[PDB]
Amino acid sequence: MNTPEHMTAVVQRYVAALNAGDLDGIVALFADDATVEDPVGSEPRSGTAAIREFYANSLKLPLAVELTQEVRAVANEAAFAFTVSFEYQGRKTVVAPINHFRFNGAGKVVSMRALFGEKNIHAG
Amino acid sequence: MNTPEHMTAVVQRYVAALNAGDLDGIVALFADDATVEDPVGSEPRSGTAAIREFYANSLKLPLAVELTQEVRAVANEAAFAFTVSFEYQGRKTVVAPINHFRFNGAGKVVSMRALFGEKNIHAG
Numbered sequence: 001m002n003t004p005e006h007m008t009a010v011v012q013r014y015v016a017a018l019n020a021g022d023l024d025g026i027v028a029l030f031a032d033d034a035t036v037e038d039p040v041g042s043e044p045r046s047g048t049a050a051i052r053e054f055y056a057n058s059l060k061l062p063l064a065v066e067l068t069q070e071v072r073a074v075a076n077e078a079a080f081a082f083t084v085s086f087e088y089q090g091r092k093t094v095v096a097p098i099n100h101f102r103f104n105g106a107g108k109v110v111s112m113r114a115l116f117g118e119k120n121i122h123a124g
Numbered sequence: 125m126n127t128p129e130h131m132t133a134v135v136q137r138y139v140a141a142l143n144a145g146d147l148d149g150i151v152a153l154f155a156d157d158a159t160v161e162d163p164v165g166s167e168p169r170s171g172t173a174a175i176r177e178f179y180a181n182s183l184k185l186p187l188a189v190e191l192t193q194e195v196r197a198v199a200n201e202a203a204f205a206f207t208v209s210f211e212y213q214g215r216k217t218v219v220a221p222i223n224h225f226r227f228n229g230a231g232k233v234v235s236m237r238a239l240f241g242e243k244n245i246h247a248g
């Protein structure tokens with residue numbers, strides 16, 4: 001089993017990598033055969049190449065990312081509440097999802113699902 | 125598809141029924157083939173009898189439950205952050221999970237998962 005300390009560390013790294021625009025740092029969190037379903041209900045990207053391209057695209061504009069509550073971490077999974085903030089053509093948006101990671105025995109994320117809908121997207 | 129509004133309203137009803145100690149009210153939100161997995165990593169309870177038992181056990185102590193952020197809801201799924209507090213023999217415990225619901229086409233919950241570990245529990 002993964003430790004809750006390791007899984008919580010991974011969540012914090014993930015948030016810091018997004019704030020820094022650190023693409024390699026984000027990708028290095030995932031297993032080679034991971035999948036990302038973001039948002040939930042959308043079609044999953046799987047494998048390093050699709051996931052790296054997903055994140056490269058998610059970084060086109062500067063992001064401000066905050067963890068907004070403690071991480072929940074048990075068995076081999078973690079879930080966390082956060083906000084992502086960005087501005088485009090002078091319009092500020094704040095998206096507030098809850099994401100879920102499942103981790104493999106080597107402590108990499110094999111699965112991320114990002115749960116948020118239109119209700120969870122707000123103005124500056 | 126379920127509307128986010130209907131899922132959101134169900135999360136609220138769930139929370140209100142736990143506060144009221146209203147067992148029938150909680151169990152009326154689930155499909156008769158629903159599963160509950162709580163804690164995540166434990167063995168999923170399946171079907172109306174096991175679901176009603178899980179809840180009747182939870183309700184042996186009065187619970188104070190409150191959502192602590194907006195509900196996230198999309199496709200046929202919702203996730204929510206909250207606290208549940210209870211007290212037994214002057215010892216008070218506060219737990220802060222993140223739960224996840226999936227809903228069927230009738231608008232009933234077909235799966236709940238409560239994600240939290242020891243680090244999300246505070247007893248004193």
Ligand SMILES: C[C@]12CCc3c(ccc4cc(O)ccc34)[C@@H]1CCC2=O
Nearest residue numbers: 142162182187208219221223238245
């Ligand atoms: C199960 C639960 C989430 C976690 C939880 C509840 C009640 C008592 C608890 C006691 C614990 O030591 C740890 C977790 C819980 C809630 C009752 C309804 C619900 O969703």
